[PDB]
Design an enzyme around this catalytic site. Sequence first.
Site, PDB file in Angstrom:
ATOM      1  N   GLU A  62      38.178  14.782  22.396  1.00 42.20           N
ATOM      2  CA  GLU A  62      39.541  14.674  22.218  1.00 42.20           C
ATOM      3  C   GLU A  62      40.200  14.592  23.518  1.00 42.20           C
ATOM      4  O   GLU A  62      40.381  15.393  24.425  1.00 42.20           O
ATOM      5  CB  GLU A  62      39.790  16.082  21.834  1.00 42.20           C
ATOM      6  CG  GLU A  62      40.980  16.377  21.168  1.00 42.20           C
ATOM      7  CD  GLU A  62      42.375  16.646  21.732  1.00 42.20           C
ATOM      8  OE1 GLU A  62      42.801  15.883  22.762  1.00 42.20           O
ATOM      9  OE2 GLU A  62      42.686  18.090  22.107  1.00 42.20           O
TER      10      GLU A  62
ATOM     11  N   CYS B 112      48.190  18.473  24.992  1.00 38.64           N
ATOM     12  CA  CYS B 112      47.821  17.017  24.567  1.00 38.64           C
ATOM     13  C   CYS B 112      48.467  16.706  23.335  1.00 38.64           C
ATOM     14  O   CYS B 112      48.368  15.364  22.848  1.00 38.64           O
ATOM     15  CB  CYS B 112      46.209  17.177  23.885  1.00 38.64           C
ATOM     16  SG  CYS B 112      45.689  18.528  23.116  1.00 38.64           S
TER      17      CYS B 112
END
Lengths: 522, 522, 522
Positions: free
Chosen positions: B268, B303
Amino acid sequence: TPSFATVSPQEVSGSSPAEVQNFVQGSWTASANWNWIVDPLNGDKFIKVAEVQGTEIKSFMESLSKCPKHGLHNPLKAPERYLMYGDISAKAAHMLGQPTVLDFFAKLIQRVSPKSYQQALAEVQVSQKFLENFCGDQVRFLARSFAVPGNHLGQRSNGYRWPYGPVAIITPFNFPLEIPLLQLMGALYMGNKPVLKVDSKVSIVMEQMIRLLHDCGLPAEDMDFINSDGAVMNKLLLEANPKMTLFTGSSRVAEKLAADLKGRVKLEDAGFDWKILGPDVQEVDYVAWVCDQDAYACSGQKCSAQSVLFMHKNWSSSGLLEKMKKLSERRKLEDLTIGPVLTVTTEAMIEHMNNLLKIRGSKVLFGGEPLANHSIPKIYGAMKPTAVFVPLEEILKSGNFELVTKEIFGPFQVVTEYSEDQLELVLEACERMNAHLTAAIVSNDPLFLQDVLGRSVNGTTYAGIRARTTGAPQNHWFGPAGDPRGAGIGTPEAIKLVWSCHREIIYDVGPVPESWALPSAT
Amino acid sequence: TPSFATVSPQEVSGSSPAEVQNFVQGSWTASANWNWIVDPLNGDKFIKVAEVQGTEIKSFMESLSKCPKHGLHNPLKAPERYLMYGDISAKAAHMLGQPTVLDFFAKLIQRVSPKSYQQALAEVQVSQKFLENFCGDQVRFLARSFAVPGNHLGQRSNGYRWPYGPVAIITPFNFPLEIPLLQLMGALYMGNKPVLKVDSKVSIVMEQMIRLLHDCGLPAEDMDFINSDGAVMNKLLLEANPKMTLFTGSSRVAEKLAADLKGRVKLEDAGFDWKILGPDVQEVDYVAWVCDQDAYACSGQKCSAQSVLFMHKNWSSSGLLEKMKKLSERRKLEDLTIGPVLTVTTEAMIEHMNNLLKIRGSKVLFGGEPLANHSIPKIYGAMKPTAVFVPLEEILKSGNFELVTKEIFGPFQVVTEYSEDQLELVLEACERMNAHLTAAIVSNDPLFLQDVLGRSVNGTTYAGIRARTTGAPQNHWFGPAGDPRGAGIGTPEAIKLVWSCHREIIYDVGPVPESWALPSAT
Amino acid sequence: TPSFATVSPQEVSGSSPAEVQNFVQGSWTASANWNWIVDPLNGDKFIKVAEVQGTEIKSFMESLSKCPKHGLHNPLKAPERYLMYGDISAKAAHMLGQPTVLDFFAKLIQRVSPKSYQQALAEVQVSQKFLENFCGDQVRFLARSFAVPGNHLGQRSNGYRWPYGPVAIITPFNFPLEIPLLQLMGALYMGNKPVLKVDSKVSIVMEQMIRLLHDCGLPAEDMDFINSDGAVMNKLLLEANPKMTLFTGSSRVAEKLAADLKGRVKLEDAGFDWKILGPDVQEVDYVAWVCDQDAYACSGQKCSAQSVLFMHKNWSSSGLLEKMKKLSERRKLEDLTIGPVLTVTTEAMIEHMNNLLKIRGSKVLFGGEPLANHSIPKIYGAMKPTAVFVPLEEILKSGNFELVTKEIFGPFQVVTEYSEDQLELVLEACERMNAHLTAAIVSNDPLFLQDVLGRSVNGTTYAGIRARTTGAPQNHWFGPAGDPRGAGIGTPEAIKLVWSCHREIIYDVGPVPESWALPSAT
C-alpha cells in the site's frame, strides 16, 4: 433436413402429417391412441401425438424408480458422468449452431407455436449459447463444493450439491425448445433422472431435440419423454412420487400441483409484468420500440410480456403512445409479427376489453378488433395488438384492480398515467399484484431507480432507459421472486437451486486424543 | 486509564516521558537505545522508543524461524487456532468498544499523529468494527476451501488458503492503529507468524494495543513487535527472509523493498488521488463539505486524501470554490482540524506552491501561508489549507505534469477546470499518473459515470454526487489497483489475498479400477 | 496439414526447413537476422527463427503502449469483448478437437520438444478442454463482480476484476502449447494486451496455434508474438514496462526478473517435487507404474516430474524398486519414451550422479549410463532413466542436502528410505527445500495423509494410493505455493488471480438527507 430429424418443418401439413412419440425405458414408443393437433394457421390435422392414458403410465413409473435418491451420479459417485455431459453439451451446441439446424428448429417452432422467424430463431440461439456454457468441465464445476475446518485435527465439514434422483419437468406451449431443454439439461447435469412433459401442441420440437441429444451421446436410459393431457401427468406425479418437479405454466396448475405434491416443486408460473416510465423523458423512439416488442412480440405469448404500462405524466406529450400505435399497426399475420393466440379466444379477449371499458375514463388507445382474412381455427384467438387506457385512480379501486391486473396471454396491455405526486399509487398497485416475474423501470435517474427497485419484488427486473420486460437470455437469471418455490432457468445458480439440494458431509477421522478419558454422561 | 495500559495520553510530556519497548520471543524487552520522539505540538522529548540496533535483530530472526512454511496453523493443522482467534477478536472488540478505551486510544493517537478527536476516534471505531467482523467462526470461515469432483471414483480436487508462515508488517505514522492492527490480525488469522514494525513516531499506540491483545488471549509466541529505523528493518528483512511482507508507506521505500525482496511483498504505497466533478451541478454545500474533508482532514495526511480536483466548467459558477475557501478557513490548530505535517516541512510546501505558481495562468485559490501562533518544531510542516489552480492544458505538458502530480503529504491540493469537450484531457491526466489508489467521480449521470469508471484504474473509486476520496471503512476494500503487488486491507478478500496463497490438494484414493492393466509406456 | 498451417510436422528437416515469424502491430513479420534451431534427434538445421535483436524492439513497445491501463476491455468497458472471446474459444476448441488438427499439433510438439506421441497428444487435449471451458458466457463470467450494501440509502460497494493492460508472457521449451496458450487466453480474457514469448527452440508450435486463433477470430491487434533470446526479452520488459509479466521457466531467471521488474510478476518457476510412500503397502504394480511415468515421461522434462522418492521401509520388500527398474528399461528412443534432454547435457547428468555417489551408502539403483545408437547433438543430453539411492540420514546433512535436492531437468531421481520412526526427518527435508510445486503422498491412511499434508506446502499436492506428481489437467489448479508471486494456470481462479487485480467501486448517489446540516470540521 438434418440427420436426426423425422420431420420436415415446411412440409408438414394435413396431407403430410407428422407424429410425435414418447421415449421411455430407452426406446421410442407410441401409445394406445393418438390425438391430433391442428395447425394454428388453418386447422389442418397436421401432427398426431402419442398421448399416454392414465392406465398406461406404468413404464414411466418403472423407469423413474430405477434412479435412486442419490442420483444417477453425485459429487462422490460416478463423477465421470459430469464429464460426459460436458461432452454431450459440446456436441449438441455445435449441432444447434449449424445454420441448417438453427433454421430447422426455428421453422419447426413457428409451425406449432406461431411467432416471427427471428423470435423462433432467438429461442434456438439462447438454447445454443446455454449448451456452450456447459462444455468441458463446466458441468463438473456445477458440483463444486465448499469445506470449512473443524474444531480439532481430523475434523472438516463439507457442503455438497446433491441430486434429488427421480424428477419431473412440465413446460408450456409458448417456448417449445428453450424452457424444456434448459431445465432438462439442468436436471441431468446435477445427477437427476427426469421425465419430461411438453404441451402436446408443441412437443414435436423437444422430440426432435431429444433425437439430436441422443446423437450427441445422451444415454437412452437417462431420461424419459411423455406426451399426455394435464390430468394423466397429474396421476403420474402422484403415482411415481418424483423427488422434485419443475413446473412452468399457468398459475392455476402451478398452485394445484404445489398442493398435490405438498410443495415438492419449483414453479415458473404466470406473470402480470409492469413497465414504469420515469420522469426523465428521452430516447422516445427507442422506448416505443421496446414497448411494442415487449407487449406484442409472439402476440404477447410470453410469460415476460408487458401487460401494463405506468406512464409518467411527462411522457404524455412525448409522442410515445402515437409511436406505439404506429408500431402495433405494422404487425401482420404473414410474417407472424401478429398471429394465433393458442390459449385465449378472440371472444375472450374482446370481452375482457369491454369489461375494462365499463370503467370510468377508460378508452381503447389502439387495436381492439379481430384480425381479418385468416384461417385460424376459432379455438385460437386472432386479435390486432390492443392497448386500453384505464385511469390510475380507477385501477386502484377494488374489483377494477382484479380485472385490470388479469393476465391475458395475448397481444393486449393496459396503459395508465401517473403524475409526479402519484408514485406511491403506482408502487401500491405493484405490491398488490399476486405475480412478481418480470418488470421494467424506464429511467436513468438513480434516485428514482433505487426508490422503485427497493420498493418492488419482481424476480427479473430491468432498470435503465433501455429497460425491457422480455428477452431474458442465458447469461442471467430468469424467474420470479417472493416465493420459496420460485424456479430459475439458464444460469449455473438457477440449475443448482432448482436441481440439487444441500448435503453436508462432516469428516471426523481422528486421532482420538491420547489423553482422552471417558467423560461423565450428559 | 485502562488496565492493560502503561501510558496516560493526556499526561505524557517532556517532564513525564513515556517508554515504548519491543516484544520478541514472548517478552517485552528492556532496551536502553532510546530514540527520543518529540511532541509534534511543542518539541518536547515526550516518548523514548527502544529501537533495536544492528546486532539486536538476531532475536527477531530466531523467533520468525520458529514458524514453518506450513504456518502456526492451516486448514488441516491446529484448526482450533482459528476458533481461538475468533475468541481473541470478540474479547478485543468488546474492550475497544468501551467508552474509556475508545477515548484512551483516540487521545493517544492524537498525541503522536496529530488529528482531530473525531478523526482519531474514527480510527478506533473502524478497528473495533473490524474485530467484530471476525468473532466466532468468522476466522474459521476465512479458511473456507472449495472442491471439485475428479475424473473417476475416489478423485476430487481441493483448493485451500495456505499461510506463508514467517511474515513481516511495516506501517507508517499517519494511522497508528487502524493499518497495523488490521494487517496484524489478518496475518495471524490465516496462520502466519508476523513481526510488526510501526513508525517509531507513533508506535506507542500499537504497543498499547498489543498489551490489550495479550490480555484478550493473543499468545505470547504468535507475533513480534520491533521498533527500529528503516535501515535496521531492511537488514532484518534480508536476513530473516520472510515469505511475505506487507509494506504501507512511501512509494520510494515500497519500490526499494519490492526490489530487495524480489517481489515477495504486498504494497500500500503512495497515492495521488483525484476527484472529478461531472456536469450535473447539485448539492453544492454537501459537495464542498466533502471536498474540504477529503483534502484537509488530518491536514491531508491520508494516503486517500484529495490532491487534485478536476472541475467541470459548469461548477465554476456554483460557488463551490468560495465555499471550499470558507470551509478551509475555519480549520484551526486548537481542535487539530489543521495541524503538524510530520513528513513535509513548511518550506518544502511553500517551495512546491511557488514552483506551481511559475506555470502560466496559475493562482493561489486560498491558503498558501504558514500557520501562526504555534510551537510546532521546524522538522514538521505547519501550513494553512492550500489550493493552487493550474490550467488543465498546462498540467498536461511534460515537466509541469510531474510537478503538478507530485504527492504533497500535507494540506495541499491542485484545482483545475475542464470544459464539456475536454474530458479526454482529464482522463489522459489520470492515466498518466503512476499511482492509482483512491478517486471520486462526483456525478449522478450514469453515462458519465460508466465512461469515466470504464477508463480509469484507481483501486478504491467512489461514484455519485456523494462521492469522496477518503474514509474507506472495513466493510469494503481499500487499496490500489493496477499492480500485482497491490495490498488490500480490512475485508475477508483483502485478508485472504494478502496473507494466504492457494494450495491445491488432489485426493485420488482409488479403487484401482477393475479394467486397469499396466498401460504401455508413454 | 490443416488450412492455417504453414508447416508440415513430419516433413520439416534440414533439406525442408521451416521458419518461425513474429507477429506485431497486426501482421506477421521477420527480423534482421535468423537463428537456426537444430533437430534434437539428429542436429539438422530444420527451423529458422526470426529472433529480434535488442535494437529492433520498438514496434513491440509501440504495440503494447496502445493498451491503456484500463485494458482492451473491463467489466464496464467494451463488455462485448468478453462475448467475442467466448466465441473465439468455441471455434478454437472445435478446431483443436479435429483428429487431423490434434495429430498435427502432437507431431509438431514432438519434433521440437521430443516426447512420446501420447504425451504430446495430452498437451493438445488439455489445451482443447481448456478452450471448451470458456465458450459462450464463461469468459463473461470470469468478470463476475460482487457487491455489498452500504451504510445508507444510495450507497453500495462493488468489487471488480480489473485488467492490467499491457502485459508479457514468457514460457519454456518443455510444453510448447499448453503453458503459453492457457496463459495467453487467460490474459486476453480479463482484458489485457499480451506480448507472448516462447523459447525459440519450440516457438513454432504457438506460431501455428496463433494462426489458428486468428482464423477463429482473435483480433490482429489484440496480441503480439516475439521470438528472441532471454537477454533481448529482458530489455523489452524494462523498456516497455508491462504492468504484469507471467514467467514460466528456470528459478534463476524467475528471481532475476522478479528483481528487475520489482515484483510486478507472476512466477511458475522450477520444482524439486517429492513423493512420499506411506506405511500401508498396496497396489504395488499401480504405484510402480505411476513412479515410472512421474519420473521419466518426457525424460523427466516436466516441472512436475518426480525428483525424489521417500520410501517407507514397509515398501522395501514389496518388489516396487524391482518393478521400477523393469519399467525404466522398456523406455526407448524410437517412440520417445526416453529421449533428448534439451537443457542438461549427458556429461552434466553423469557428473551429478557421480557427485551423489561420493555420499556414504549411496548406490545406483538402475540406469546411470548414456543412451546408445543415436544422433542426438551433444548440446542435448541422452541418458537412460536413472535412479540413485541415498540414505536418508546422509541427505539431511549440510552440503549433501543442496546436492541431493538439486533439480536435474532430465530422467533422473533420488530414492531414499525412512522407517516408521523417521517421518519427521522426511518432513524436515521437505521443509528445507526451496521449491514447493508438486508432491505426492502415496497412502490411503487418513491420519498419515492429514499429518503430512498439514506439515507441507507444495502448491499442487496429490494424496491417495493413486497419487502422482505429474499430469495436472485443466480442471484443477497447477502452480506453486508459499509465494505471493506464485502463478496458477488453467482454472477460472488461476486466470483471475494471474491476469486481473481487484478494483473497488463504491456508489454513493444520494439522496443527501433533507435534515443534513454542515457539521463542524474534523
